[PDB]
Every structure is written in structure tokens, then in C-alpha cells.
Amino acid sequence: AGNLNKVNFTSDVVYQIVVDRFVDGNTSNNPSGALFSSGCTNLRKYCGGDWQGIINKINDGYLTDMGVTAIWISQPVENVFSVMNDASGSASYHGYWARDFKKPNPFFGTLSDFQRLVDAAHAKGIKVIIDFAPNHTSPASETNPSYMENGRLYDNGTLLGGYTNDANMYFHHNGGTTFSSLEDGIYRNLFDLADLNHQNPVIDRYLKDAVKMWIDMGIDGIRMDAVKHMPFGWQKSLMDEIDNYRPVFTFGEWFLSENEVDANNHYFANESGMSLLDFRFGQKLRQVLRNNSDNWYGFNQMIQDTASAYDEVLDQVTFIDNHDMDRFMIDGGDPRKVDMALAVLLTSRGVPNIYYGTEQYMTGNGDPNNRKMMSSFNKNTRAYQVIQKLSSLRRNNPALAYGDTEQRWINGDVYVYERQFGKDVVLVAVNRSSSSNYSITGLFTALPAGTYTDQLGGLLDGNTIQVGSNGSVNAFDLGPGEVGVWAYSATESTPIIGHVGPMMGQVGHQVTIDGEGFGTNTGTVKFGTTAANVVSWSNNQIVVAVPNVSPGKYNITVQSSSGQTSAAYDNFEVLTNDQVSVRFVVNNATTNLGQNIYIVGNVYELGNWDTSKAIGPMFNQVVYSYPTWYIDVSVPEGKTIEFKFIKKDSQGNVTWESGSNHVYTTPTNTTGKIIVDWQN
Ligand SMILES: [Ca+2]
Ligand SMILES: [Ca+2]
């Protein structure tokens, strides 16, 4: 324990747990009947893991001697109590079919049980991340109100309404998606889960209120579900909401396929105020180390493009697998591959996540074979020791949390990457081959001339290397499945910014800066050109309040009282004011070719009349259909705004609406909807 950092997870090791399948700490809170499967023989029903389960693993040391520092759990909220019609008889085991975002899942525990978890975590220096699924409710049939629980939504016990007879319009009624488009996937039902209508005021206040209730329990971060299923506008406004309240590390899950790259996803991580699960890394690692569909070359381009795709790559959440994929380990598979991926992940950029049981070599392909009940608590396996060693390095060498990545050597087989932050450096070499061997010559490093023992202690037949003149490393052999890790750390005395969190705020919010060379004597901090009042200074970390600057993006520099000034940390965003989700609708907006409609206006959130920063393209198929376009935008509340719509080509062309500006006074503490006509 100590001063936990809710907005800086770069130095953490995450352990993702699906509650139901971990440990059954309290058998008395077990469900019975068709909801329960004794022995977990049927993986689609409740098996029994509850919160007590977890506190036991925290207290008996399994998690803590592993080097785990943060725990990620299922959505704690009350789920539906009905069973599915399917062959299996599917229950809400996974905590994804919410019923009431304001009460606990009684199978997992009470509210108090809940509080004992966080605390049990806290006392031992372990952060807590909870799943939160604001997109939908539960599986429903409009036409068959008997189906499950009609996707019923409760408010602390009181009903709001179901999918059938939605007088209120709490949900969407545009069929389910086909994933034919981004739009298709937001305003349509993900499968048959009842899709919440975030534009609705009741809904918008209800979800925002709930998140708060949980934060109040003292969690440390949130993991958002079906990130590419909610609008964008609304989500940004929710992030505005948590930040004003009490900043917590938040990240969304935008599933990406094996060779998938999507600029929209890039944009989401960069602008929403929330970071993202790193699928590109995920899938990519999977290719080279488990699928043999790619090599290091791919991996390397992956790393390079990734650092340029994301403004804060350091904020991405990494993994070799999760609740949603086929476990890394296959039956009959080679367990050392796991060890290898683990060693790779723990030393890579981004916040590293380990899926429960990875360290036990658990197997299972597809849902729900990928969610068996925790097999063993064997603390002696190779996987576990590698986490042990690497978790300590990561806690120790800053290059791991904040350094960039440089390729020092590579074969389709051999990859030797370097991590550096200031003088801090960690060198890593891996031979993925099972049979070919190599002799690493002409290897060059940032490590100070010397002798280095493998940071693994030879767990993967790691060697001792020697650094001579000119950063030249002495030739050495690298056999099949070999992994060696060498690090160098030293005091800094030049101000270096390692991380900034959050990356979004209002005037007067609290921003935390992490680094080195800050110096014990409090200096000065700047946002662009303005000095920021500081609340606390240390050579490692400084907390400051955003100065009173104009809305926009600013660079952050650090100047020690000795005059040194740090390189800047880019893109801190200062928002005009409290955000609200507004639905901008435009009628009779006909178009050409690639031509699309956008929105631009007089406020920062709407680009300040710069068509290069216009919001869009706008939607025109679901809620409204072309020639009518719509979009949900996050914008300042209680503000009279001016905006116009524009048609933008494939290659830049801009066609303005041709008359006076459209005016509108954005609502306060709630959503708004505005519809106008394209002024020809
Ligand atoms: Ca139980
Ligand atoms: Ca949706």
C-alpha cells in the first residue's frame, strides 16, 4: 500500500478476472436452480466465484507474490435472473446483462462485500478496475415479452421500463446490427441485447449517476464495453463527467481483427478521453508466437506505426489474450511460448494485462470454453515466475513504463528491442524458433559499457552480456526459445516527462505529471505559455491545476528551479466547459460522390470554424435517413452556439451552407436535440 495512482497505470501489471470462474469464496451467495451449474460442467451458467473469492486470493498471497498490482473484474451491477431458451440454458454469469446499474450482483456479493474487496485490494497496493456496460441491458424480444426479462431496466429497485411498450423510448427500436457499418453498429441492437438510447434524458442521467455510485466505492479505473457501439459524442460527455467528478483510469474495448487497422479506432483512443485495449498488439503478437502467420518484421512495423497512430501509446492496454479470444495456450501446445509472450508483453510499451489462468497454462477455444473455472494456484510454474521477475523490473526500471521502442536487431526469428527513458534502458532479445540458433553480432545498445546478468535469472536460458566500446555488445549465441533481459537504471537530474493524466480537463482540474529529474525543489509548470499553479512537487511527480487558458490543445513542459526545462508532453486538452451530448440534425442535405456532411461552429468542440477540424462525417441511415443527416456531439453546456454544415469531398473540397449561421443554446446538465434545414 501507499498513494495509489488512479490516472497512471503505465507501471502496473493487470490481472483480469471473470468473477464467476475464479474462486467461490462464499457458497451461501450461490444461485440455485437452472441458474447454477455445480462443478461448472456447463460453462454458460453461474459457477460460483464471488467477491469473497478474490479477497481470499489477495489475502493468501497468490496475487501479491505474483507481482500483480491491479485487478480487473466483471461489471459488479445487478444482472438479469432469467435463463435463456438456448440448449445450454444461459445465465448472466459474465455480468454483462445488466438489470440495475445501481445495485450489486447478489451472486458476487453485497455492497459491503464489494467495499471489502476494494479495501482488501487497497491495503496491499492493488488497484481495482471494474467492467461497466452502458450500451445495453439484456437479451430481449419486443414481440415476445416473455423472453428473459424484456430487457427490463431498474433504478435502485424501481422500474424504468422494458423493451416491449417503450412509451418512454428508453431504448432503440431499429432491429439488431449486421455490422454493415459503424452507424449500423451504434443505433442497432448488438445481437438481441436491449440497446439504450443515450440521447434520452432519463438514460443519460441514470448511467452518469451510476458510474458515480461505483467511483464512490473507490475503484481505480474502468473498462468500457462495446466502445464502437456507443455514438462518440455521448461517450466523450461521459468522460467529461467522470473527470469533473473524480478522475479514474478508463479504457474501452474496440475489437480489432488479426490484420485490422481502423482510423476511427485511432481517433477514439486519441480524442474520447478514454484509452483502449491494444488489439493490434494483441493479434500481432498472436501471429508470431502462437499462429505463425507473421514474423518479427510485421511485429516491428506494428510497433512503429502504433507509436504514430496513438498520441498516448503508453496508455494502451496490452494482452496476449482475454475474455473475448481463444486462449494463447492450445491443448498439446508448447508452454514455453506462453512464457515467451509473457516476457514480451511485460517489457513492451502500454499497460500490460494478464487474463486469469495464463500463468497456469489454461486452455479453451471460443466462448465459453475460454472461461473455465480457475484450475490451480500453483505458484511454481514458469509463467508465474516470469511475471514475478518482470513485474519487479517494471516497477523498478522507468524505461518499461515510459520508454519508447527501438529495434536493435531482427530476423523473421530473432528480435532484439530496446526500451529507453532518459538514461534508463532495458534490452531484450528473443529467438522464437524451436530449432534454429543464432549468433548476435553487430548488436548495438544504449546500455552503459559493462557486464549484465539476465533480468530473468535464466528462466528462459538467459545469458550474461558484456558491453564494450561504442555500445557494442559481444557476440553471443541465441538458441531456440531463448529470452534474455538486461537493464540499466541511474539517477536523472534533467526534467523528463514520463506520463500525464488525465489528458482532458476543464480549468482548475487536477493533472498529475510523472517522471524524473523534477528535483526536490518545486519549480514551474507550463501549459503552452502559461504557468500553472502547482499543488505538489516532487522529483518524480507533480500535481497541478490547469491554468485559465483558452480552450484547445496545449503542450506541457517542466522546468526545475535550476532552470532546466523538459521536452514537452503533447495534446493536453482544455475543454470550454462541462459537456453535454447534443444531437445535431440536418435536413435536405443532398450530396455527391465521396461527399459527406460535417458540422463546424464557433466553439472549440465544433472546431472554431476550421473545416479541417469539422465534426463528421455525419450519419444518414438509421435514426434519420439521407437526405437527412445527424450526429451526436459532445459540447459545452448553457452556451449559445453558432454553427453551419458543410459538404466535404474525398480530397478536401469544402462547400458551405450558403446563408446566416444556425444558432442554438445548448442545454445544461442534460442532452439536447436540434434540427434545421440545409440553407441553400
Ligand atoms: Ca459464491
Ligand atoms: Ca448501441
XYZ file of C-alpha atoms and ligand atoms in Angstrom:
682
model
C 0.000 0.000 0.000
C 0.612 3.731 -0.312
C -0.565 6.593 -2.552
C -2.257 4.684 -5.411
C -2.344 6.483 -8.792
C -5.776 6.330 -10.418
C -4.656 8.133 -13.575
C -1.310 6.451 -14.224
C -1.246 2.668 -14.827
C 1.911 2.510 -17.005
C 3.850 0.981 -14.155
C 1.184 -1.664 -13.390
C 0.554 -5.340 -14.087
C -3.081 -6.144 -14.639
C -4.771 -9.368 -13.736
C -8.187 -9.808 -15.440
C -10.714 -11.910 -13.585
C -14.102 -13.154 -14.632
C -15.524 -13.415 -11.123
C -17.863 -16.351 -11.559
C -14.966 -18.605 -12.596
C -12.266 -17.516 -10.172
C -12.842 -18.711 -6.590
C -16.140 -19.418 -4.791
C -15.350 -17.516 -1.592
C -18.968 -17.544 -0.327
C -21.011 -20.619 -1.287
C -24.030 -19.179 0.504
C -24.437 -16.404 -2.114
C -24.638 -19.103 -4.759
C -27.554 -19.155 -7.146
C -29.524 -22.417 -7.334
C -31.901 -23.967 -9.870
C -31.294 -23.603 -13.588
C -29.060 -20.592 -12.883
C -26.326 -22.683 -11.322
C -24.025 -25.447 -12.510
C -22.369 -27.347 -9.697
C -18.884 -28.349 -10.795
C -19.045 -25.809 -13.647
C -19.749 -28.674 -16.010
C -21.859 -26.236 -18.102
C -19.762 -23.075 -18.672
C -22.726 -20.895 -19.681
C -24.295 -20.847 -16.190
C -23.248 -19.429 -12.804
C -20.379 -21.449 -11.340
C -19.915 -19.633 -8.015
C -16.967 -17.249 -7.910
C -17.897 -14.219 -5.859
C -16.023 -11.263 -4.334
C -15.038 -13.193 -1.211
C -13.279 -15.475 -3.679
C -10.965 -12.707 -4.776
C -10.235 -11.282 -1.312
C -9.008 -14.787 -0.390
C -6.527 -14.739 -3.249
C -5.472 -11.254 -2.271
C -5.027 -12.170 1.374
C -3.394 -15.640 0.941
C -0.788 -14.102 -1.353
C -1.363 -15.771 -4.750
C -1.923 -12.380 -6.447
C 0.626 -10.369 -4.481
C 3.527 -12.813 -4.673
C 2.854 -12.883 -8.403
C 3.700 -9.203 -8.775
C 0.057 -8.354 -9.726
C -0.700 -4.708 -8.901
C -4.093 -4.183 -10.414
C -7.131 -6.357 -10.688
C -9.778 -6.107 -13.439
C -13.186 -7.520 -12.620
C -16.531 -8.189 -14.227
C -19.270 -5.455 -14.138
C -20.460 -5.545 -10.494
C -24.039 -4.487 -11.225
C -27.195 -6.493 -10.816
C -27.788 -8.765 -13.815
C -30.968 -10.447 -15.051
C -32.193 -13.505 -13.177
C -33.926 -15.298 -16.130
C -32.444 -18.210 -18.088
C -32.100 -18.398 -21.842
C -34.048 -20.557 -24.284
C -30.891 -21.911 -25.830
C -29.864 -25.550 -25.498
C -27.399 -24.671 -22.755
C -29.680 -22.513 -20.583
C -27.599 -19.362 -20.493
C -27.389 -17.270 -17.359
C -25.988 -13.760 -16.643
C -22.801 -15.280 -15.181
C -20.446 -12.943 -17.081
C -22.017 -9.804 -15.548
C -22.738 -8.286 -18.969
C -26.614 -8.462 -18.943
C -27.387 -5.608 -16.591
C -30.653 -5.258 -14.821
C -29.921 -2.427 -12.388
C -26.774 -0.314 -12.679
C -27.342 0.822 -9.090
C -27.231 -2.457 -7.136
C -24.737 -5.271 -6.678
C -24.932 -8.687 -8.332
C -26.060 -10.690 -5.255
C -24.298 -13.807 -6.556
C -20.980 -11.939 -6.452
C -21.805 -10.299 -3.112
C -23.389 -7.399 -1.211
C -22.389 -3.726 -1.439
C -20.288 -4.213 1.731
C -18.662 -7.355 0.347
C -17.864 -5.102 -2.521
C -16.289 -2.478 -0.266
C -14.213 -5.162 1.461
C -12.827 -6.098 -1.928
C -11.557 -2.640 -2.884
C -10.178 -2.189 0.646
C -8.615 -5.659 0.644
C -7.080 -4.567 -2.643
C -6.065 -1.134 -1.395
C -4.350 -2.249 1.797
C -1.992 -4.356 -0.323
C -1.219 -1.760 -3.015
C -3.574 -3.172 -5.648
C -5.771 -1.068 -7.847
C -9.303 -2.047 -8.859
C -10.826 -1.840 -12.322
C -14.467 -2.783 -12.949
C -16.257 -3.655 -16.151
C -19.069 -1.137 -16.974
C -21.500 -1.805 -19.812
C -23.617 1.273 -20.580
C -24.583 0.339 -24.148
C -27.274 -2.206 -23.362
C -29.340 -4.066 -20.836
C -30.174 -7.745 -21.529
C -31.430 -10.069 -24.295
C -34.920 -9.087 -25.321
C -37.750 -9.702 -27.701
C -40.064 -6.806 -28.419
C -42.604 -9.201 -29.826
C -42.235 -11.854 -27.071
C -42.349 -10.036 -23.716
C -41.830 -13.402 -22.041
C -38.288 -13.618 -23.332
C -35.949 -13.473 -20.381
C -36.841 -10.186 -18.611
C -37.899 -7.930 -21.521
C -34.518 -6.155 -21.180
C -36.005 -4.535 -18.136
C -34.163 -1.613 -16.580
C -34.415 -0.894 -12.845
C -33.373 2.197 -10.840
C -32.359 1.046 -7.389
C -35.276 -1.453 -7.402
C -37.827 0.812 -9.124
C -38.640 0.023 -12.769
C -37.943 2.339 -15.677
C -39.433 0.092 -18.376
C -38.878 -2.848 -20.719
C -38.307 -3.337 -24.456
C -41.989 -4.081 -25.048
C -44.145 -0.964 -24.726
C -41.266 1.558 -24.609
C -43.583 4.601 -24.391
C -40.633 6.452 -22.842
C -38.247 5.385 -25.667
C -35.528 4.329 -23.199
C -34.224 2.013 -25.893
C -33.684 1.878 -29.639
C -36.095 0.055 -31.949
C -34.192 -0.236 -35.236
C -33.552 -4.003 -35.321
C -30.203 -5.592 -34.498
C -26.925 -4.946 -36.309
C -25.402 -6.717 -39.232
C -22.165 -4.814 -38.741
C -22.536 -3.403 -42.245
C -21.250 -0.096 -40.910
C -20.060 1.905 -37.943
C -23.503 3.578 -37.907
C -25.240 0.198 -38.238
C -23.426 -0.911 -35.068
C -24.346 2.057 -32.876
C -28.046 2.670 -33.439
C -28.888 -1.006 -33.799
C -29.081 -3.795 -31.209
C -25.895 -5.720 -30.556
C -27.449 -9.183 -31.060
C -30.704 -9.084 -29.062
C -29.389 -7.053 -26.107
C -31.722 -4.087 -25.488
C -29.977 -1.020 -26.809
C -30.151 2.009 -24.531
C -30.998 5.322 -26.123
C -28.283 7.567 -24.662
C -29.903 10.704 -26.118
C -32.819 10.174 -23.739
C -32.517 12.428 -20.665
C -33.620 9.820 -18.125
C -30.984 7.389 -19.530
C -28.286 9.976 -19.778
C -28.767 10.965 -16.136
C -29.214 7.363 -14.887
C -25.951 5.974 -16.356
C -23.937 9.045 -15.296
C -25.336 8.749 -11.758
C -24.482 5.043 -11.573
C -20.862 5.403 -12.658
C -20.575 7.883 -9.811
C -22.012 5.477 -7.217
C -19.276 2.995 -8.139
C -16.454 5.514 -8.242
C -17.618 6.495 -4.762
C -16.873 2.897 -3.738
C -13.244 3.927 -4.512
C -12.415 1.949 -7.654
C -9.275 2.924 -9.546
C -10.311 2.634 -13.174
C -12.981 1.484 -15.574
C -13.116 -0.750 -18.625
C -15.874 0.310 -21.064
C -17.692 -2.373 -23.125
C -18.813 -2.138 -26.788
C -16.969 1.162 -27.268
C -17.711 1.057 -31.017
C -21.406 0.532 -30.205
C -21.963 3.900 -28.486
C -22.024 7.159 -30.513
C -18.791 9.017 -29.652
C -20.407 12.291 -28.596
C -22.101 10.717 -25.635
C -19.018 8.797 -24.500
C -16.853 11.947 -24.537
C -19.511 13.675 -22.463
C -19.400 10.750 -20.029
C -15.619 11.099 -19.760
C -16.164 14.798 -19.087
C -18.469 13.625 -16.332
C -16.017 11.264 -14.618
C -13.147 13.746 -14.856
C -15.086 16.637 -13.268
C -16.155 14.149 -10.590
C -13.045 12.144 -9.739
C -10.648 11.107 -12.486
C -10.244 7.340 -12.849
C -8.205 5.473 -15.491
C -10.696 4.475 -18.203
C -10.378 2.281 -21.268
C -12.691 0.963 -23.912
C -12.792 -2.226 -25.894
C -12.972 -1.734 -29.660
C -12.459 -5.216 -31.008
C -9.999 -5.401 -33.906
C -9.313 -8.413 -36.167
C -5.973 -10.066 -36.922
C -4.694 -7.636 -39.605
C -7.163 -4.886 -38.854
C -6.352 -1.221 -38.807
C -9.184 1.361 -38.379
C -8.596 5.112 -38.282
C -11.904 5.520 -36.441
C -10.499 3.428 -33.581
C -7.345 5.549 -33.769
C -9.475 8.647 -33.363
C -11.452 7.078 -30.494
C -8.309 6.390 -28.404
C -6.944 9.864 -29.248
C -9.993 12.054 -28.644
C -12.587 10.386 -26.433
C -10.759 10.947 -23.106
C -10.579 7.136 -22.765
C -7.715 4.863 -23.922
C -8.075 1.377 -25.468
C -7.349 -2.351 -25.332
C -4.450 -2.800 -27.775
C -5.798 -5.389 -30.249
C -3.212 -4.587 -32.930
C -0.506 -5.533 -30.466
C -2.674 -8.384 -29.260
C -3.434 -10.029 -32.589
C 0.007 -9.224 -33.849
C 1.818 -10.971 -31.041
C -0.509 -13.880 -31.588
C 0.663 -14.200 -35.185
C 4.381 -14.530 -34.437
C 4.291 -16.517 -31.202
C 1.207 -18.738 -31.476
C -0.122 -18.658 -35.061
C 2.998 -18.471 -37.208
C 1.126 -16.175 -39.582
C 3.655 -13.363 -39.220
C 7.216 -12.705 -38.084
C 9.172 -10.032 -36.233
C 9.182 -7.772 -39.291
C 5.428 -7.494 -39.012
C 5.693 -7.049 -35.235
C 8.253 -4.292 -35.709
C 6.174 -2.344 -38.267
C 3.316 -2.967 -35.802
C 5.284 -1.235 -33.021
C 6.437 1.651 -35.270
C 3.043 2.501 -36.832
C 1.385 2.084 -33.415
C 3.508 4.761 -31.730
C 2.479 7.121 -34.534
C -1.162 6.075 -34.595
C -1.651 6.778 -30.884
C -0.888 10.099 -29.197
C -0.529 8.270 -25.890
C 0.520 4.753 -26.935
C 1.693 4.390 -23.310
C -1.996 4.463 -22.347
C -2.961 1.447 -24.469
C -3.867 -1.746 -22.585
C -1.953 -4.789 -23.796
C -2.588 -8.509 -23.671
C -1.847 -11.833 -25.366
C -5.486 -12.820 -24.821
C -8.735 -12.013 -22.991
C -12.294 -12.983 -22.184
C -13.050 -12.471 -25.858
C -10.406 -14.610 -27.590
C -9.037 -18.131 -27.878
C -6.549 -18.633 -25.026
C -2.923 -18.261 -26.088
C -2.285 -21.897 -24.991
C -3.773 -24.698 -27.111
C -4.110 -28.327 -25.992
C -0.882 -30.041 -26.810
C 0.740 -26.600 -27.322
C 4.277 -25.712 -26.208
C 4.039 -23.926 -22.863
C 7.335 -22.063 -23.308
C 5.619 -19.981 -25.984
C 3.400 -18.621 -23.223
C 6.477 -17.830 -21.127
C 7.886 -16.055 -24.165
C 4.763 -13.997 -24.958
C 4.591 -13.039 -21.243
C 8.219 -11.864 -21.265
C 7.451 -9.897 -24.432
C 4.297 -8.341 -23.101
C 5.694 -7.306 -19.722
C 8.574 -5.372 -21.353
C 6.505 -3.807 -24.124
C 5.012 -0.322 -24.196
C 1.408 0.090 -22.918
C -0.277 -1.144 -19.674
C 0.020 -4.952 -19.536
C -2.945 -7.210 -18.817
C -2.865 -10.905 -17.986
C -6.029 -12.973 -18.377
C -6.682 -15.183 -15.339
C -5.005 -18.540 -15.554
C -2.386 -17.587 -18.164
C 0.227 -18.430 -15.526
C -1.413 -21.846 -15.176
C -1.414 -22.545 -18.938
C -5.255 -22.892 -19.061
C -6.823 -23.799 -22.445
C -10.174 -23.333 -24.218
C -11.111 -22.115 -27.707
C -14.207 -19.927 -28.380
C -16.883 -18.645 -25.929
C -17.318 -20.103 -23.297
C -14.518 -22.695 -23.415
C -12.274 -19.681 -22.805
C -13.845 -19.126 -19.387
C -13.331 -22.388 -17.466
C -13.110 -22.316 -13.646
C -9.628 -21.453 -12.272
C -7.714 -24.743 -12.446
C -4.814 -24.211 -9.996
C -2.989 -21.885 -7.683
C 0.392 -23.424 -8.364
C 2.870 -20.622 -7.689
C 5.877 -22.543 -9.092
C 5.192 -22.566 -12.858
C 7.467 -20.792 -15.293
C 4.761 -18.361 -16.393
C 4.258 -17.118 -12.806
C 7.979 -16.721 -12.101
C 8.481 -14.687 -15.283
C 5.669 -12.371 -14.188
C 7.307 -12.184 -10.762
C 10.657 -11.031 -12.146
C 9.286 -8.795 -14.856
C 6.711 -7.167 -12.590
C 9.544 -6.072 -10.337
C 11.634 -4.695 -13.258
C 8.623 -2.774 -14.489
C 8.129 -1.295 -11.002
C 11.824 -0.601 -10.889
C 13.102 0.499 -14.362
C 11.183 3.501 -15.693
C 12.036 2.620 -19.299
C 9.418 -0.101 -19.016
C 6.531 2.250 -18.130
C 7.593 5.198 -20.242
C 10.333 4.412 -22.713
C 9.914 4.246 -26.449
C 10.860 1.233 -28.571
C 13.831 0.783 -30.847
C 14.631 -2.364 -32.878
C 18.320 -3.212 -32.376
C 18.260 -6.493 -34.274
C 15.933 -8.720 -36.224
C 15.375 -11.891 -38.229
C 11.946 -13.346 -39.032
C 13.022 -15.345 -35.949
C 15.113 -13.103 -33.762
C 14.040 -9.720 -32.439
C 16.040 -7.582 -30.077
C 14.263 -4.486 -28.888
C 15.355 -1.693 -26.607
C 13.377 0.389 -24.144
C 14.785 3.735 -23.031
C 13.612 6.637 -20.891
C 16.345 9.211 -20.186
C 19.379 7.083 -19.246
C 17.094 4.230 -18.283
C 17.413 1.267 -20.576
C 16.225 -2.267 -20.871
C 17.477 -4.515 -23.647
C 15.595 -7.587 -24.789
C 16.301 -10.403 -27.183
C 14.054 -13.283 -28.244
C 14.509 -16.240 -30.555
C 11.020 -17.538 -31.408
C 12.435 -20.554 -33.173
C 12.171 -24.032 -31.766
C 15.173 -25.252 -33.736
C 17.425 -22.638 -35.415
C 20.177 -20.903 -33.438
C 21.927 -17.583 -33.865
C 24.989 -15.537 -33.179
C 24.057 -11.977 -32.477
C 26.913 -9.919 -33.923
C 26.890 -6.222 -34.701
C 24.414 -5.724 -31.878
C 24.446 -2.146 -30.564
C 22.976 -0.781 -27.347
C 22.261 2.271 -25.219
C 23.417 0.379 -22.115
C 26.468 1.824 -20.402
C 29.604 -0.219 -21.114
C 29.614 -3.135 -18.643
C 28.517 -6.654 -17.753
C 24.847 -7.556 -17.392
C 23.126 -10.603 -15.959
C 19.777 -11.654 -17.479
C 16.910 -9.990 -15.555
C 15.114 -13.358 -15.909
C 17.797 -15.234 -13.958
C 17.968 -17.702 -16.880
C 14.264 -18.725 -16.672
C 14.433 -18.812 -20.490
C 18.154 -19.686 -20.747
C 19.067 -16.019 -20.482
C 22.717 -15.151 -20.652
C 25.166 -12.633 -19.271
C 26.221 -9.983 -21.764
C 29.121 -7.584 -21.968
C 29.047 -4.023 -23.249
C 32.346 -2.771 -24.623
C 33.345 0.302 -26.600
C 30.880 2.137 -28.789
C 27.798 0.453 -27.350
C 28.955 -2.739 -28.999
C 27.756 -5.982 -27.457
C 29.987 -9.029 -27.618
C 28.837 -11.784 -29.924
C 26.677 -14.337 -28.185
C 24.567 -17.299 -29.137
C 20.823 -17.254 -29.037
C 19.288 -20.709 -29.111
C 15.689 -21.746 -29.662
C 13.196 -20.239 -27.203
C 15.923 -18.098 -25.644
C 14.964 -14.847 -23.909
C 17.409 -12.535 -22.051
C 16.696 -9.189 -20.362
C 19.290 -6.551 -19.398
C 18.529 -3.263 -17.701
C 20.247 -0.114 -16.749
C 18.920 2.493 -14.407
C 20.529 5.622 -12.995
C 19.541 8.912 -11.416
C 18.238 11.656 -13.668
C 18.861 15.355 -12.989
C 17.267 16.724 -16.134
C 13.479 17.051 -16.029
C 11.822 14.359 -18.120
C 8.075 13.852 -18.516
C 7.114 10.213 -18.470
C 3.285 10.459 -18.339
C 0.392 12.891 -17.970
C -3.023 12.032 -16.624
C -5.741 12.575 -17.386
C -5.259 14.123 -20.871
C -8.513 16.049 -20.775
C -9.997 18.592 -18.396
C -11.605 21.853 -17.506
C -9.924 24.929 -15.962
C -8.873 24.151 -12.402
C -8.868 20.335 -12.691
C -6.137 18.220 -11.114
C -3.496 16.872 -13.507
C -0.739 14.509 -12.439
C 2.707 14.506 -14.020
C 5.014 11.525 -13.608
C 8.721 11.471 -14.475
C 12.233 12.092 -13.221
C 14.672 14.979 -12.739
C 11.790 17.049 -11.392
C 14.052 17.889 -8.483
C 13.038 18.097 -4.837
C 12.766 21.859 -5.065
C 9.406 22.884 -6.559
C 9.880 24.664 -9.898
C 7.386 25.806 -12.541
C 4.992 24.025 -14.916
C 3.503 25.396 -18.138
C 0.572 24.706 -20.426
C 1.782 26.240 -23.687
C 2.976 29.586 -22.381
C 1.037 29.878 -19.090
C 2.445 28.938 -15.704
C 0.218 26.562 -13.772
C -0.413 26.821 -10.037
C 1.138 23.703 -8.511
C -0.457 21.749 -5.690
C 2.517 19.444 -5.004
C 6.014 18.882 -6.232
C 8.441 16.034 -6.088
C 11.277 14.909 -8.313
C 9.048 12.122 -9.594
C 5.599 13.562 -9.580
C 3.844 16.895 -9.562
C 0.151 17.640 -9.371
C -1.078 20.910 -10.791
C -4.359 22.656 -11.605
C -4.935 23.564 -15.271
C -4.366 27.321 -15.589
C -7.026 29.639 -17.010
C -6.198 29.289 -20.710
C -8.436 29.305 -23.734
C -9.983 26.007 -24.770
C -7.758 23.903 -27.063
C -4.646 21.734 -27.058
C -1.576 22.580 -25.047
C 1.943 21.334 -24.562
C 3.327 20.693 -21.100
C 6.882 21.411 -20.144
C 8.636 21.123 -16.803
C 11.310 23.471 -15.600
C 13.267 22.600 -12.444
C 14.131 25.549 -10.144
C 17.637 25.216 -11.565
C 16.315 26.349 -14.942
C 16.400 23.071 -16.866
C 13.217 22.628 -18.937
C 11.834 19.257 -20.045
C 10.924 18.329 -23.655
C 7.126 18.837 -23.893
C 4.330 16.318 -23.454
C 1.713 16.839 -26.161
C -2.001 17.258 -26.566
C -3.396 18.137 -23.110
C -6.956 19.136 -23.962
C -8.678 22.008 -22.176
C -12.447 21.912 -22.647
C -14.562 25.037 -22.815
C -16.867 23.813 -20.079
C -18.973 20.948 -18.715
C -20.005 18.668 -21.589
C -23.434 17.555 -22.691
C -24.446 15.273 -25.578
C -26.238 17.206 -28.336
C -27.874 15.633 -31.377
C -27.350 17.859 -34.446
C -29.771 17.068 -37.263
C -29.716 18.498 -40.774
C -32.470 18.080 -43.385
C -32.327 18.178 -47.174
C -28.555 17.889 -47.276
C -28.077 16.223 -50.678
C -24.638 15.111 -51.795
C -22.253 13.958 -54.469
C -19.598 11.236 -54.766
C -17.491 10.731 -51.673
C -19.124 13.920 -50.469
C -20.187 13.959 -46.823
C -21.742 16.399 -44.395
C -19.882 17.834 -41.433
C -20.618 20.394 -38.749
C -18.457 23.386 -37.843
C -19.218 26.231 -35.433
C -17.903 29.000 -33.177
C -16.820 26.807 -30.229
C -13.721 24.613 -29.778
C -15.820 21.458 -29.606
C -17.133 22.326 -33.079
C -13.733 23.341 -34.480
C -13.775 27.166 -34.260
C -14.800 27.499 -37.874
C -11.829 25.457 -39.136
C -13.270 22.998 -41.694
C -10.062 20.981 -41.111
C -11.419 20.263 -37.622
C -15.108 19.822 -38.551
C -17.120 17.070 -36.781
C -18.231 14.218 -39.067
C -18.841 12.582 -41.434
C -22.418 12.661 -40.182
C -24.814 9.689 -40.167
C -27.673 9.300 -42.624
C -29.093 5.774 -42.474
C -30.531 4.699 -39.083
C -32.112 7.246 -36.699
C -32.762 9.501 -39.703
C -32.138 8.674 -43.384
C -30.481 10.670 -46.106
C -31.006 13.397 -47.235
C -31.279 13.995 -43.508
C -28.013 13.706 -41.536
C -27.428 13.548 -37.804
C -24.643 13.236 -35.304
C -24.268 13.186 -31.555
C -21.721 15.742 -30.414
C -20.135 16.429 -27.019
C -20.340 20.216 -26.429
C -20.281 22.924 -23.768
C -23.483 23.365 -21.745
C -25.552 26.537 -21.298
C -23.861 28.057 -24.327
C -25.272 29.896 -27.302
C -23.545 28.441 -30.303
C -23.286 29.216 -33.946
C -22.631 26.512 -36.490
C -23.045 25.655 -40.168
C -22.982 22.388 -42.127
C -20.509 21.700 -44.887
C -20.050 19.184 -47.625
C -16.518 17.786 -47.832
C -15.041 15.894 -50.783
C -12.817 12.834 -50.801
C -9.866 15.154 -51.359
C -10.613 18.186 -49.186
C -13.208 20.258 -51.064
C -15.494 22.252 -48.824
C -18.953 23.525 -49.697
C -20.557 25.759 -47.122
C -24.186 26.174 -46.292
C -24.860 29.495 -48.012
C -26.660 31.931 -45.616
C -26.504 33.175 -41.972
C -25.304 30.974 -39.052
C -27.527 28.462 -37.299
C -27.890 29.388 -33.616
C -28.645 27.217 -30.608
C -28.323 27.475 -26.849
C -27.012 24.122 -25.653
C -28.776 22.589 -22.686
C -27.363 22.452 -19.159
C -26.780 19.168 -17.317
C -28.729 17.241 -19.923
C -28.906 16.325 -23.596
C -30.296 18.369 -26.443
C -31.552 17.839 -29.985
C -31.514 20.460 -32.768
C -32.830 20.006 -36.308
C -32.502 22.606 -39.061
C -32.681 22.890 -42.834
C -29.710 22.994 -45.188
C -29.658 26.645 -46.201
C -29.027 26.616 -49.940
Ca -20.453 -17.869 -4.164
Ca -25.634 0.947 -29.395
